[PDB]
Each structure stands twice: as structure tokens, then as C-alpha cells.
Amino acid sequence: KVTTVVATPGQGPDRPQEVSYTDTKVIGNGSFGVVYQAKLCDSGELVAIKKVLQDKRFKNRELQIMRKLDHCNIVRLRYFFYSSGEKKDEVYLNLVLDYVPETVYRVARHYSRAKQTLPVIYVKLYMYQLFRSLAYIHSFGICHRDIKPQNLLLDPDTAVLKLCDFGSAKQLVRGEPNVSYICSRYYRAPELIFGATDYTSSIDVWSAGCVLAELLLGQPIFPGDSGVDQLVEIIKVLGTPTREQIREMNPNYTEFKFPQIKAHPWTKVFRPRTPPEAIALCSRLLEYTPTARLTPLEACAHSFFDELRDPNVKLPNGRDTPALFNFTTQELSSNPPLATILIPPHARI
């Protein structure tokens, strides 16, 4: 069963071309609409296809964002095309994406079930690549807002990571309201829980820290049932936020009772073998004040990732590391002098 459609290149010239695919299999449910796997007849390559319902009366936000993005650490929009069906009367937007075989969730769950933690070398590789993608999208003012282990795709052999699913992504601008009920509770920034409409891209950074901690711990650091229990889990570790911190999150909560609760030491949080720099990175990712959190680019330059900038560093399978040093001007636009650290001498010329 072979399907032939007229598709438009994702970031391309905007000249539609005929594309044929086959072997349609369901991968799972994306943010909005389900995700299929398929094989391009021409190349033989595997792709992911997220079919979403499109309303003819307005433009698709995800599509607008996706056509801007080209990055090694982000799942790329190969093509897009339209189709109809499902009671008809409407049109579906089909996003043809890179196919990637694995997720951090599946890998983390694979180690946790064996009562083990992911080797620090993978934690370094995966987190660094996530921060790069974050640094890239935030430079367009674009906030992913879905950051979580399930949306972190992996190639197990090459150890390449790719951020995926921008169905919740928004381009943020000063003076506009945004839904405070967003992300996923375990990875939801505290200001979001306070119902702050004014939040920035720093919320993705918070989520990243939650992922980092989870990979160190072996479980989500901030569990719990209600959205209000989420805040309880956070203060059980970070301690009751100061008045000045509440102000920086949601000013509408500045004066309130809020019983003082001692912060649980970061070193007592993780297992005794946990690297010091891993703990320092995590502590600078998770802060009540969003402005106090590291920028993704700053995170990349953190001492925790110094092992990746070693000329002799290799994967546990003997293969070379993926390209970590390939930063463009757009990636570095937030802090160009950081390249002095980010791009090691051995990768300069």
C-alpha cells in the first residue's frame, strides 16, 4: 500500500513536489493528533508523520515555527502536506519529520528497572544536546513548553539527541498573556503553578533541570498528584521561597503567610557517588527566580560538560561523540564570547 502526495519542503523554497511513501505504522499520540511511521519510496529513509486537524480559518502555529528551525539537535520538518478524511468536512495537516528510534524516557526506564542509574557520560551527552536545541529555539524567542523525557528522542548507536513535538510551542513576546497551565506537572515551573501569565523561556530551563535531576536520581524529583502537590514537592527540596522570590514569580502572591520550611541540601538529595558539578548545574537550573536560572547557552559551558570538550573523549561503544561544537551565529546570539569555552582549541581549526 503506497501513498503518493504533493508535499512542500519544510524550510525549503516553497515549491511543492510529489512524494511517495509506504509501510505506515503507528508510533503513538503526539501533542495534537497521532504520529505515524513510514518509509520514503525514493530514499528508503524512515520518517515520522504527525497528522493534525487543521482549521481553514486560521494558520497553524506549529507549522510556522517548524519552518524556521534547522538544528542537529532538533527533529527536522522534511515536508508538510494536506489531506482530508475522518467524517470529512475538514482538512488535516501532515508533518513529515525525522524518524528517531529511541527516547530518553525509554532509556531511563530501562536502567531504573534494573535498579541502576544511567552512566554520567550519557547524562552529559544528552543534557548538553538538549541545552543546545534550547539555546537555538530561544534565540528566535521560541519557547518549547513541552520539555520532558518523552519528547527527547535518541539514536542509541550515535548517541545523538533530538528535541521533538512543537505542538505546544509558542513565540513569546513582552506584553502578551500565555496559558499558565502548561507543560507536564513533573516538569512544570513554579511560576506556572502560581498561575503567572508573564513567564519567559526560562520555564524550559526549569524543565531541563527536572530531566537532569531525574537522570541522576532514577525517578522524577518532583512527583505528585495535584498541581498543588507539585508545589509541595518543590518546596520540600528547595525550601519555602522568600518574599522576593515570590515577587519574581507571581507578584500577586507577594504578601502571604507561607510557613518557613528548611531547604533539603542538594548533596543529600542525590546518591553519594553523584558528581559535584552535576549537583552545581542542577542547583543553578532549579531556582524560584526565573531570571536566576542559567540560560541554555550558559548551561552548555558549565563545568559538568567539560568531559565533552576533551579531545580524547569517546562513546562507551568506542565510537566518536556526535558533533557538539558545530554552533552557528544564531545559537551563540545570546552570548557570543562564550564560544571561547564552547568551542575547544582542538575543534577550532
Binding site: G195, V228, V232, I235, K236, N252, F256, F258, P259, I261
Partner: peptide, 17 residues
């Protein structure tokens, strides 16, 4: 909303200590 939410939050902290 703000005073309402802070009241069910402050309660669950009296329960944690």
C-alpha cells in the same frame, strides 16, 4: 483566585511539618 489558592497550599504545608 490568589488568596483562595494560597489557603489550600498553606494547609498542605502544615501537614508536611
Amino acid at each position: 483566585e490568589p488568596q483562595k489558592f494560597a489557603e489550600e497550599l498553606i494547609h498542605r504545608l502544615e501537614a508536611v511539618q
